[PDB]
Design a protein around this ligand. Structure first.
Ligand SMILES: CCCCC/C=C/C/C=C/C/C=C\C/C=C\CCCC(=O)O[C@H](COC(=O)CCCCCCCCCCCCCCCCC)COP(=O)(O)O[C@@H]1[C@H](O)[C@H](O)[C@@H](OP(=O)(O)O)[C@H](OP(=O)(O)O)[C@H]1O
Ligand SMILES: CCCCCCCCCCCCCCCCCC(=O)OC[C@H](COP(=O)(O)OCCN)OC(=O)CCCCCCCCCCCCCCCCC
Ligand SMILES: CCCCCCCCCCCCCCCCCC(=O)OC[C@H](COP(=O)(O)OCCN)OC(=O)CCCCCCCCCCCCCCCCC
Ligand SMILES: CC(C)CCC[C@@H](C)[C@H]1CC[C@H]2[C@@H]3CC=C4C[C@@H](O)CC[C@]4(C)[C@H]3CC[C@]12C
Ligand SMILES: CC(C)CCC[C@@H](C)[C@H]1CC[C@H]2[C@@H]3CC=C4C[C@@H](O)CC[C@]4(C)[C@H]3CC[C@]12C
Ligand SMILES: CC(C)CCC[C@@H](C)[C@H]1CC[C@H]2[C@@H]3CC=C4C[C@@H](O)CC[C@]4(C)[C@H]3CC[C@]12C
Ligand SMILES: CC(C)CCC[C@@H](C)[C@H]1CC[C@H]2[C@@H]3CC=C4C[C@@H](O)CC[C@]4(C)[C@H]3CC[C@]12C
Ligand SMILES: CC(C)CCC[C@@H](C)[C@H]1CC[C@H]2[C@@H]3CC=C4C[C@@H](O)CC[C@]4(C)[C@H]3CC[C@]12C
Ligand SMILES: [Ca+2]
Length: 1274
């Protein structure tokens, strides 16, 4: 059957049918079957027989034994054979090898369509460079887990329980006990664990799982608070804050940098260049053809005039039909719940009027029409459908608001947007294939989850909304886990369904793999799409706006590039191969400095303040300091106004700060309405912002941030328009439907009145009936926008999805899982905004990042990366490893046992065994086991101690310290010796201060094996080195954190701490550090919307101990300005984070795009080690014997590739200005610069006649480098 014209199509149809059958299965607990599932069970033998037939046709009629082109030698066919063979065994039992393996059946579509094979191959190829990053992740997870094992092991097993109510009860977020006891009539008692004994550091596996959950920023604050009340809140913050900073933010930065570098490198491949050239020529032909079409119409209009639809090409008509769209846009954006009765009638007539008018507009007739026709026909279908079945109206006329994007034509930003759309439309098959492949993998994971946890989530308190029972529910749960929101809560259910923490922990692997390969594969795919489609648009725009300049300069006849642009252009060309004394007093040298000190002092004073106790000694002294601060601030500016003459800028905020402070005690000391005083005193939080103008580097980074915002604003407009469209559609879907009664029995507001018995937590209670609304809803467009923003941030969106699914009708209480098709809206929203637009913003910031340090046009004008390499030649001192000089019986004899391969390998084995021992501890270990662990540490610390004292014998006491790593080893071993001495000696002990930190010195031996990792070490060092080159972006982020913390403390600092809310003893604005921790928690996005709601409205106020008054409560505190305060913080911080990451990525863009074929900075180490090894001591001289054999042993990618080009290579040495005129001259730097010129920027060999101008250019380009280069040239 070697000819299969449609055989493959029929097999594909069979696979599709099998996928559909697998999608209709429903899983029930305790061996229960739906009658539909029993019928579906009958279809399996047919599929098994068909697949057996197709396998037999390819085994014995294509080849199985002949190894060349056999059936099983293909990787994509062994999977098919495994699936068919395991399916056969399932019918032989008439379960893991029987039914749990048929979830790979959808993966047979990938092998069926080789296009999907190519797409998957590209996906995998793009993800290879991330592997090393993954290694750097695992070590980090290994590093902190061990630290968590030595401190938190077994410390989370007691909790406050005693309530004289049945040896039970306690707070819903249970309060673990510690070294201080319960605060009240509670007593410490044995506790299973925080998440039913799952979130803990008992052994290394639990610690690793907890650390992995924390680095994903999912519930890490709960872990932090569990150890805050179990061991005190003094040092726990020192473990979790770095863990998020290193494990989560740093890894994300590294992943983004590596991915962007790989995308830039791979955009210059031959096939990609050919495709882009094809697209460019298509666009150029279209551009030239469009202009000629104007001639045909203009001529045709004239002849008919001198012997038709000329009004539809005029500005007036194009503006009227665009203002009518704007009028329609506002018409649909005013619909809201409980709208006035006349407004409904007016809008009902307006929709008909607008539909008729737009039909009339169409009657008088790019793809503008191709989209307008679709919008209008959809509107007709929607209005016709609504009339036949009244009650529901999704709303599609709002899609015609997309025509408002045509207003960009009058601007100068139309070319870039049109190019972006053109590039996206050209590369649409690839995008569709990528989305389909992601859908296929999601389907496979949903089926696997249905097998593992299907029909197992109905516990005693009810089944969760995120279950794997039906296919829609399983796919929703898998999507939620992929987005990484509340995945730990699903993992907890998946563990306690397989047998609890005892024997169900193996089910965590599913969620770990899903989280990893959804967090990073999704980012890879979508960032690749965004980068490859935005760089193409940038190149098209630059080639379209530069061919008109050249043409215009020819019509008369007859380097602000970003780092990305420069690097990508260079990568391509290298691939083919009275006012008299006031002026004096303000112009003093030591004047601005004292202003900085006073501003910093005022900021620190703002930091130290109690918002609850208004009238205290500290607050009084702080106000007294504020008096002199505002006096000096008035004095700093009155001398400038009588100097610069007021207005004949940036210091407007300084003026408002100075003025508002005077009014602050003008009204306070005027003598009722004390609230205006507090509201006016929040102004002084702009005091830190006064340092931006004074510091020039801070001003530079602020200007860079502003320019980035200006660059992104154009796409921000489109993002806002799409968000508005979605919000308008979301209103028509869930307007007024987010209401519920406190008891599930009642459905409307009429019944929801009175009292009812509540049977929660196995306890009865009489509670009033309240007709409440969900906290986040879609009642109007502002609430819809806020809800969609919170969903886009990714916080609490599963709860909003559940509320939307429970939606039933206009004014009725929810019905569980009533409308499950409402999850289409959220899936589409997630695919569009957080998956595509955010990556568009990131890519646009990446590819349009202007260099900040240089800010110069012609720094070298020939290259950019070799400037460091050019200056590296004079800085490449042969730093030796300090070999012994004595060569005697004492120093040398022991030295041969240091460089010997027995010693180093033995030390590596000892390090590996020590790391194995470190993770061998667990809670409730036998006493003999702990004793063995203790004595094992003693053995290892002697070997490392002996190694430390054996190095100093050979290298030298003042010589062994010359290396950073040897200092680290000495400090580690000294700390370990101190630790073992202090806690083992019978009489040398302590009873007071706790020296428990010394355990870190024992756990800091992991970094030793970091010496083995070469590329990991280089990458880490490069990123760390480029982190300290920009110490003012971090300063800007710190300033934003400080300002927002001060604002929150001054505004939300007096809210009463209440449990069951998110402003409690753990999370509040009471102190500066508490507010800073709250802001960090919100930045990581834990429950920031819950905090925003809990600091919103008329919350009860903290009792003020001081300031006596004649009332009891006066007024409630807590503003309604919380919304802005959080919505502005989630944006700003995020932006300020992104502008940081790119600032680190573009600083190392030379490393991230290495192109290891003509590498020059990475090759310097090889030449350095060769020169060091050949001459034991440099002595400032080079012999005339080893040069002629240098190119042979030196790496092939430079100098010498083979014997055929060896003649050319040698001709690149002779017949020019040779240094061998004097045989005792320099022969290293000469051939180095010869190689550098030959490898890059060949400009002298071709000419070979003029050399003085090149020497002058080299001398003038390196004037301030201590110019001893007079002999380097020779
Ligand atoms: C992958 C994750 C999930 C994706 C989620 C979706 C994400 C989508 C989100 C964001 C993508 C974009 C942001 C930038 C967008 C719009 C701003 C301006 C660009 C734009 O849309 O304008 C056009 C409209 O054509 C369409 O395709 C009309 C349809 C585009 C309008 C926006 C609707 C987007 C639908 C398709 C977008 C992607 C395709 C695109 O450019 P065009 O080439 O199609 O039309 C040209 C263009 O307008 C030129 O001005 C002009 O060229 P010539 O023929 O040489 O004269 C002609 O117009 P005039 O004669 O009047 O001068 C037209 O012939
Ligand atoms: C990049 C730059 C931007 C990064 C922003 C990072 C912001 C977050 C880092 C600061 C987190 C501080 C955590 C403060 C905290 O809540 O810890 C409590 C502890 C003092 O607590 P203590 O007084 O022992 O007990 C109070 C009883 N409730 O607090 C301390 O001991 C804090 C001492 C800090 C020094
Ligand atoms: C490539 C990856 C790179 C990774 C690099 C990782 C670097 C960062 C890791 C360092 C983290 C150290 C955090 C220490 C957390 C301490 C936790 C804790 O609660 O320990 C307190 C303990 C004192 O004990 P106590 O709380 O009194 O209760 C037990 C005794 N009854 O003990 C203490 O008082 C601890 C004192 C610690 C002092 C600062 C140490 C730094
Ligand atoms: C000089 C300014 C600008 C910088 C330093 C400001 C801070 C550190 C100073 C200024 C005023 C000070 C307070 C003044 C009065 C009291 C009351 C008493 O219980 C002693 C400590 C306490 C609570 C001080 C703590 C430290 C404090 C808050
Ligand atoms: C793969 C990711 C991107 C999700 C893709 C969306 C598809 C596969 C999912 C998401 C929402 C799902 C729908 C949600 C609810 C319902 C209502 C139910 O009575 C029939 C099935 C149906 C109609 C589901 C079919 C599958 C579905 C359309
Ligand atoms: C270019 C952009 C603006 C296109 C946006 C398309 C979005 C808004 C459309 C495309 C698919 C649509 C969904 C398709 C199906 C359903 C099920 C129906 O019972 C309620 C509406 C709902 C849930 C639609 C809501 C709106 C929707 C998500
Ligand atoms: C040789 C090393 C590197 C293997 C990897 C270490 C892991 C898999 C080993 C090392 C020590 C082991 C622990 C030793 C003893 C017990 C006590 C038992 O009641 C529960 C399991 C538990 C807590 C083990 C879990 C697995 C464990 C943590
Ligand atoms: C160099 C390191 C990595 C080697 C680790 C292996 C040794 C030290 C470990 C592995 C197996 C362990 C033993 C396993 C079982 C028992 C029996 C128990 O009743 C007391 C502890 C005791 C006796 C353990 C002591 C430590 C032990 C011998
Ligand atoms: Ca979250």
């Amino acid at each position: 059957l070697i000819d299969w014209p449609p055989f493959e199509y029929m097999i594909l149809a069979t696979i599709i049918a099998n996928c559909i059958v697998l999608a209709l299965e429903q899983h029930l607990p305790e061996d229960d079957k739906t009658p539909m599932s029993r019928r579906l069970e009958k279809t399996e033998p047919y599929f098994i027989g068909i697949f057996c037939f197709e396998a037999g046709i390819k085994i014995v009629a294509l080849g199985f034994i002949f190894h060349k082109g056999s059936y099983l030698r293909n990787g994509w066919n062994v999977m098919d054979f495994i699936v068919v063979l395991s399916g056969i065994l399932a019918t032989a039992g008439t379960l893991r090898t029987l039914r749990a393996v048929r979830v790979l059946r959808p993966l047979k579509l990938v092998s069926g369509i080789p296009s999907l094979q190519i797409v998957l191959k590209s996906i995998m190829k793009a993800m290879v460079p991330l592997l090393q990053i993954g290694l750097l992740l695992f070590f980090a997870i290994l590093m902190f887990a061990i630290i968590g094992l030595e401190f938190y092991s077994g410390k989370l097993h007691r909790a406050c329980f005693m309530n004289n109510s049945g040896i039970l009860e306690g707070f819903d977020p249970p309060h673990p006990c510690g070294v201080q006891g319960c605060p009240a009539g509670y007593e410490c008692k044995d506790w299973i664990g925080p998440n039913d004994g799952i979130t803990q550091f008992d052994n290394i596996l639990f610690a690793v799982l907890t650390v992995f959950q924390c680095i994903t920023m999912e519930g890490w604050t709960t872990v932090l608070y569990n150890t805050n009340d179990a061991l005190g809140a003094t040092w726990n913050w020192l473990y979790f804050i770095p863990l998020i900073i290193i494990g989560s933010f740093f890894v994300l930065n590294l992943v983004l940098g590596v991915l962007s570098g790989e995308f830039a490198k791979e955009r210059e491949r031959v096939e990609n260049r050919r495709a882009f050239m094809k697209l460019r020529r298509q666009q150029q032909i279209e551009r030239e053809l469009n202009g000629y079409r104007a001639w045909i119409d203009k001529a045709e209009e004239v002849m008919l005039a001198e012997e038709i639809r000329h009004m539809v090409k005029s500005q007036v008509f194009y503006w009227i039909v665009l203002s009518l769209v704007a009028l329609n846009t506002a018409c649909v954006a005013i619909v809201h719940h409980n709208q006035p009765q006349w407004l409904t009638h007016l809008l009902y007539y307006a929709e008909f009027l607008f539909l008729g008018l737009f039909l009339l507009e169409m009657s008088l007739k790019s793809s503008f029409n191709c989209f307008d026709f679709g919008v209008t026909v959809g509107s007709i279908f929607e209005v016709v459908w609504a009339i036949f079945r009244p009650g529901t109206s999704f709303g599609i006329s709002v899609l015609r608001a997309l025509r408002l994007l045509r207003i960009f034509k009058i601007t100068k930003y139309w070319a870039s947007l049109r190019n972006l759309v053109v590039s996206l439309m050209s590369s649409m098959k690839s995008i569709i294939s990528l989305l389909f492949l992601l859908f296929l993998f999601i389907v496979v994971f949903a089926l696997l989850g249905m097998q593992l946890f299907g029909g197992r989530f109905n516990f005693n308190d009810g089944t969760p909304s995120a279950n794997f029972d039906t296919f829609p529910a399983a796919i929703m749960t898998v999507f939620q886990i992929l987005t990484g929101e509340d995945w730990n809560e699903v993992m907890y259910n998946g563990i306690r369904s397989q047998g609890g923490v005892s024997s169900g922990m193996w089910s965590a692997i599913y969620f770990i793999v899903l989280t990893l390969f959804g967090n990073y594969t999704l980012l890879n795919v979508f960032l690749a799409i965004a980068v490859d489609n935005l760089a193409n648009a940038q190149e098209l725009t630059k080639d379209e706006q530069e061919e008109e300049e050249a043409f215009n300069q020819k019509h008369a006849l007859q380097h602000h590039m970003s780092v990305w642009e420069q690097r990508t252009s260079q990568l391509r060309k290298h691939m083919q191969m009275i006012r008299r004394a006031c002026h004096y007093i303000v112009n003093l040298r030591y004047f601005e400095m004292c202003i900085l000190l006073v501003i910093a002092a005022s900021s620190i004073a703002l930091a130290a303040e109690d918002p609850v106790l208004t009238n205290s000694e500290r607050n009084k002294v702080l106000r007294y300091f504020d008096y002199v601060f505002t006096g000096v601030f008035t004095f700093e500016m009155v001398i400038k106004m009588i100097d610069q003459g007021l207005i004949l800028l940036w210091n407007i905020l300084d003026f408002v700060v100075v003025v508002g402070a005077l009014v602050a005690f003008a009204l306070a000391n005027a003598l009722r309405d004390i609230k205006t005083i507090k509201s006016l005193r929040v102004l002084r939080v702009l005091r830190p912002l006064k340092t931006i103008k004074r510091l020039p580097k801070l001003k530079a980074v602020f200007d860079c941030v502003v320019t980035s915002l200006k660059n992104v604003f154009n796409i921000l407009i489109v993002y806002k328009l799409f968000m508005f469209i979605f919000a308008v559609i979301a209103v028509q879907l869930f307007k007024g439907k987010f209401f519920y009664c406190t008891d599930s029995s009642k459905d409307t507001e009429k019944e929801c009145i009175g009292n009812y018995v509540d049977h929660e937590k196995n306890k009865m209670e009489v509670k009033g009936r309240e007709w409440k609304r969900h906290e986040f809803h879609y009642d109007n467009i502002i609430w819809a926008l806020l809800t969609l923003f919170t969903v886009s941030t990714g916080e609490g969106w599963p709860q909003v999805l559940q509320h939307s699914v429970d939606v039933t009708e206009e004014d009725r209480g929810p019905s569980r899982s009533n409308r499950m098709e409402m999850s289409i809206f959220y899936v589409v929203y997630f695919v569009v905004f957080p998956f595509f637009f955010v990556n568009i913003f990131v890519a646009l910031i990446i590819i349009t990042f202007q260099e900040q340090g240089d800010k110069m046009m012609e720094e070298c004008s020939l290259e950019k990366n070799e400037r460091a390499c050019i200056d590296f030649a004079i800085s490449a001192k042969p730093l030796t490893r300090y070999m012994p000089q004595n060569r005697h019986t004492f120093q040398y004899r022991v030295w041969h046992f240091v460089v010997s391969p027995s010693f180093e390998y033995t030390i590596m084995a000892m390090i590996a065994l020590n790391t194995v021992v470190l993770m061998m501890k667990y809670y409730s270990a036998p006493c003999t086991y702990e004793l063995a662990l203790k004595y094992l540490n003693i053995a290892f610390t002697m070997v490392f101690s002996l190694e430390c004292v054996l190095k100093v014998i050979a290298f030298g006491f003042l010589n062994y310290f010359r290396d950073t790593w040897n200092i680290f080893d000495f400090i580690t071993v000294i700390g370990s010796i101190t630790e073992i001495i202090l806690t083992d000696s019978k009489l040398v002990n302590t009873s007071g201060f706790n020296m428990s930190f010394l355990k870190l010195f024992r756990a800091a031996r992991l970094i030793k094996l970091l010496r083995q990792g070469y590329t990991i070490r280089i990458l880490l060092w490069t990123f760390v080195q480029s982190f300290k080159a920009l110490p003012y972006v971090c300063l800007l982020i710190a300033m934003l954190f400080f300002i927002y913390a001060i604002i929150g403390m001054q505004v939300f600092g007096n809210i009463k701490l209440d449990e069951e809310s998110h402003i409690n003893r753990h999370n509040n604005f009471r102190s500066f550090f508490g507010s800073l921790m709250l802001l960090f928690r919100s930045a990581t996005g834990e429950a920031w919307q819950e905090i925003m709601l809990s600091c919103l409205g008329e919350k009860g106020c903290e009792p003020d101990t001081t300031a006596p008054s004649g009332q009891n409560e006066n007024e409630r505190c807590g503003t309604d300005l919380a919304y802005v305060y959080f919505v502005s913080f989630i944006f700003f911080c995020s932006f300020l984070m992104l502008n940081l990451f790119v600032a680190v990525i573009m600083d190392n863009f030379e490393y991230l795009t290495r192109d290891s074929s003509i590498l020059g900075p990475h090759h310097l180490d090889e030449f350095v080690r060769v020169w060091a090894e050949y001459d034991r001591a440099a002595c400032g001289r080079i012999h005339y014997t080893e040069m002629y054999e240098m190119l042979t042993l030196m790496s092939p990618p430079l100098g010498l590739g083979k014997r055929c080009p060896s003649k050319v290579a040698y001709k690149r040495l002779v017949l020019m200005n040779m240094p061998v005129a004097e045989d005792m001259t320099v022969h290293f730097t000469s051939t180095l610069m010869a190689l550098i010129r030959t490898a890059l920027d060949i400009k002298i060999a071709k000419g070979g006649a003029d050399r003085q101008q090149l020497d002058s250019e080299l001398q003038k380009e390196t004037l301030a480098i201590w110019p001893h280069l007079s002999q380097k040239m020779l």
